[PDB]
């Protein structure tokens, strides 16, 4: 009449780790356009770049909240070892 | 005394056209000489000088003016039966040369000579080498000319090299030879081909020019090995250069021109080796076939057009094939000369960062998308396979046109996002094709460069261990219900982004929860984002009068699994049901429009045009038939392709801020103040191994670095800042 019945199904996903969602970490209040500095500090250039930074380790802050920390630590804020960078 | 000197000249006036006079005579003549010396005796010289000096004279008043072919047929004879005699005659004033000349603190042979060039410095200077220019005026023909005729002429001059006084000459005697003749001789067969030139210039050929005054530079080569001396050659060469080649640069110019509008190429070479040999020859032609090709490549892809635009195989070919054909040019009329190689490669890089294509696009950047373009549509499953070192070889083709790609962030980030699917997917061609490019690519551009592409490897082969690790864990106590199979990816390592809100329908329920569970079992605090927008999975139709196995997106088997009940839905029904935003149900119902598993209302509807509406009923279609049992409706929005690219294009622009940023900090740290244009002129010299930041751009990044207080203007200053920490 009208039968579809699923056989095969090939699905995919991120994997992540999970100190979750919760903010962001260095600074914590959501991966959003906030990581503090910008939210205040609006309307400005600075702000309007607010993105993701991830890991290597795969812990990810906002960019800005690691840019923020390198200039005085390397390590990783979340794992001990050192920074990496990748994806934006 | 007198005595011996009457009987010495007897003999001496003998030595010379000697009848092969009797050794009894020279041993005479020896020690007749010796007693001579011994009775200083200078006088002998004194003597012997005299009655050279007056023989030759009275030679002189013989052949006296007479030039030519003339003093030819004479002054050969005459200076060599003299030299003989001459020598002869040293070798009987021996005991003179010896004590007589050491006393100094004058040989006669050479005595001999200094006395001939008083032959010389008369009729045998002047108008006998205006003979030999008389002769070898044959240079055009005829024959004949017997070198011996000259040779003689011309060892003598260089022969009378001179002796008066150095003593013996250190480097060749020759000042003679060149005064008297090669200065005479050049000046002479310069007007020789100076005439022949501009006259054949303009009565034969800018092809049969050169293939003539090519062979009568080895002429003249040739006429110096055997009426010579050693260098009048390059001298001479150095003449005839100028005269055939380089007067008539201008004259080549435009005929090499013409000579790459028509491919008449060995035309090319001689135009080439003939100024090659002029100092600073080819510096034009090389600016000739520089700018030349330039426009070859510029049009072939013009032609293309709008088509090329969008096909990367046609748009990359069309380049390589202006490359591979100059190449050879280079490479064989060229002799591959680094110079002429340049030429190629400055035009290349010229047209293929910016040409019809990238001017429609609107771009330089689309290059490097269209070689990154093709590569995909050379590493994807292809509809059989592709042969090994055919793959390979154009592989290494694509790394050619690579070679010249502006930006190489630009290829580089799409052959990153197309191997993130190829490997998502199972889908590669060859899988040692990936690994080559993949190397193919890390030589140039270091691990760096490729490091994600590693990254996204071997992050893959993880996903097949754990997905095993599942599969197993099934034949445990566990079983699932359908073919269930995952990919778990590293939110990091992948250029993927989660997803449009699904709703995952019921018959995948089971499988989701399970390996939910299952991955609970390895990272304590892991989180699973599921990408439905990236997931297979297969259907299987029983209400079709025909057994299909649509081979499907998840989206499409959710809206799909929805006609599991209620057979039409609107839009709006899917969009609540399948939780699957309209701005994609609407492209994802288009699909499913377009294969006709789903129909609407109006059977005249033109799905591929029309626009769907939340109250737009999506009917099942039930009467459906596929010419094919298993269809793979899975081909989503074409648009899709369009928003990737763009929004691919703009992942770049963002990412190139702040690798400029990254720069102006890294710089303005190295310098700490710092003049703008410095500062601008050192971000390119860094960045571009991989792209021309428009300065525009970075004189943005300058301001935001200066917002996020990582460097300021010192006050006070034109356009200077502070590296502030
Ligand atoms: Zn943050
Ligand atoms: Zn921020
Ligand atoms: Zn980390």
Request: aromatic share 14%.
């Given at each position: 009449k009208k039968r579809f019945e699923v056989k095969k199904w090939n699905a995919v996903a991120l994997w992540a780790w999970d100190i979750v969602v919760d903010n962001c970490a260095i600074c914590r209040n959501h991966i959003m356009d906030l990581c503090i500095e910008c939210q205040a500090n609006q309307a400005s250039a600075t702000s309007e770049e607010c993105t993701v930074a991830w890991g290597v380790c795969n812990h990810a802050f906002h960019f800005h909240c690691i840019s923020r920390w390198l200039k005085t630590r390397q390590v990783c804020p979340l794992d001990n070892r050192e920074w990496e960078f990748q994806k934006y | 005394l007198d005595q011996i000197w009457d009987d010495l000249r007897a003999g001496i006036q003998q030595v010379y056209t000697r009848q092969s006079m009797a050794k009894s005579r020279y041993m005479e003549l020896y020690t007749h000489v010796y007693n001579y010396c011994t009775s200083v005796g200078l006088e002998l010289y004194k003597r012997l000088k005299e009655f050279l000096k007056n023989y030759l004279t009275n030679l002189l008043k013989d052949g006296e003016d007479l030039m030519d072919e003339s003093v030819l047929k004479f002054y050969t004879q005459q200076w060599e039966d003299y030299r003989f005699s001459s020598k002869v005659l040293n070798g009987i004033c021996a005991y003179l040369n010896r004590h007589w000349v050491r006393r100094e603190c004058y040989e006669i042979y050479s005595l001999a000579l200094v006395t001939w060039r008083d032959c010389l410095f008369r009729p045998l200077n002047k108008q006998v080498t205006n003979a030999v220019l008389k002769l070898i005026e044959k240079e055009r023909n005829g024959e004949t000319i017997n070198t011996r005729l000259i040779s003689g002429v011309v060892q003598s001059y260089v022969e009378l090299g001179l002796n008066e006084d150095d003593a013996f000459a250190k480097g060749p005697t020759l000042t003679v030879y060149k005064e008297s003749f090669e200065s005479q001789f050049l000046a002479d067969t310069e007007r020789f081909y100076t005439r022949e030139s501009t006259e054949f210039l303009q009565q034969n050929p800018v092809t049969e020019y050169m293939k003539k005054a090519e062979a009568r530079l080895l002429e003249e080569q040739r006429r110096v090995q055997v009426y010579l001396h050693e260098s009048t050659q390059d001298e001479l060469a150095r003449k005839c250069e100028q005269v055939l080649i380089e007067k008539h640069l201008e004259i080549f110019h435009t005929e090499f021109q013409n000579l790459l509008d028509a491919d008449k190429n060995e035309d090319l070479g001689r135009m080439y080796n003939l100024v090659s040999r002029i100092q600073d020859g080819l510096g034009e032609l090389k600016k000739l076939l520089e700018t030349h090709i330039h426009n070859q490549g510029l049009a072939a892809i013009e032609k293309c057009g709008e088509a090329a635009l969008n096909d990367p195989k046609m748009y990359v070919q069309t380049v390589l094939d202006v490359h591979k054909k100059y190449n050879a040019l280079?490479?064989?009329?060229?002799?591959?000369?680094?110079?002429?190689?340049?030429?190629?490669?400055?035009?290349?890089?010229?047209?293929?960062?910016?040409?019809?294509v990238t001017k429609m696009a609107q771009s330089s950047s689309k290059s490097p998308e269209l070689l990154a373009r093709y590569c995909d549509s050379l590493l994807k499953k292809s509809s059989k396979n592709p042969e090994e070192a055919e793959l390979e070889d154009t592989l290494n083709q694509v790394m050619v046109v690579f070679k010249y790609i502006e930006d190489k962030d630009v290829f580089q980030k799409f052959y990153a996002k197309m191997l993130?699917?190829?490997?998502?997917?199972?889908?590669?061609?060859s899988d040692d094709a990936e690994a080559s490019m993949i190397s193919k690519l890390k030589q140039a551009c270091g691990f760096e460069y490729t490091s994600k592409l590693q990254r996204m490897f071997q992050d893959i082969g993880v996903s097949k261990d754990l997905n095993e690790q599942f599969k197993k864990h099934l034949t445990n106590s566990?079983?699932?219900?359908?073919?269930?199979?995952?990919?778990?990816?590293?939110?990091?390592?992948?250029?993927?982004?989660?997803?449009?809100?699904?709703?995952?329908?019921?018959?995948?329920?089971?499988?989701?929860?399970?390996?939910?569970?299952?991955?609970?079992?390895?990272?304590?605090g892991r989180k699973l984002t599921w990408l439905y927008q990236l997931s297979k999975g297969e259907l299987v139709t029983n209400c079709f009068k025909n057994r299909y196995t649509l081979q499907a997106s998840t989206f499409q088997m959710a809206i799909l699994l929805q006609y599991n009940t209620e057979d039409a839905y609107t839009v709006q029904q899917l969009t609540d049901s399948t939780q699957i935003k309209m701005d994609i149900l609407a492209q994802v119902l288009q699909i499913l429009l377009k294969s006709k598993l789903l129909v609407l209302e109006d059977e005249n509807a033109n799905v591929d045009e029309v626009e769907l509406k939340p109250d737009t009923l999506i009917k099942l279609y039930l009467g459906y038939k596929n010419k094919k049992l298993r269809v793979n409706i899975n081909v989503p929005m074409k648009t899709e392709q369009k928003q990737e690219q763009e929004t691919t294009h703009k992942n770049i622009e963002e990412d190139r801020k702040l690798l400029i940023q990254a720069a102006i900090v890294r710089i303005m740290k190295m310098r700490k103040v710092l003049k703008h244009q410095q500062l601008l002129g050192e971000v390119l010299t860094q960045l571009s191994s991989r792209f021309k930041p428009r300065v525009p751009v970075i004189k943005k990044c300058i301001d935001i670095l200066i917002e996020k207080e990582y460097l300021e203007r010192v006050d006070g200053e034109k356009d200077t800042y502070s590296y502030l920490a």
């Open positions: - | 280079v490479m064989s009329a060229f002799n591959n000369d680094a110079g002429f190689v340049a030429a190629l490669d400055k035009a290349c890089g010229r047209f293929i960062n910016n040409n019809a993130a699917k190829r490997l998502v997917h199972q889908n590669s061609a566990e079983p699932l219900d359908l073919d269930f199979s995952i990919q778990v990816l590293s939110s990091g390592s992948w250029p993927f982004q989660q997803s449009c809100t699904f709703a995952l329908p019921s018959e995948l329920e089971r499988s989701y929860q399970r390996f939910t569970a299952f991955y609970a079992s390895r990272h304590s």
